[PDB]
């Protein structure tokens, strides 16, 4: 899986 920082 993964993730994003904005």
C-alpha positions as MATLAB code, in Angstrom:
seq = 'XXXXXX';
ca = [
       0.000    0.000    0.000;
       1.065    3.608    0.232;
       0.246    7.160    1.197;
       0.515   10.750    0.014;
       1.405   13.994    1.808;
       0.118   17.237    0.289;
];
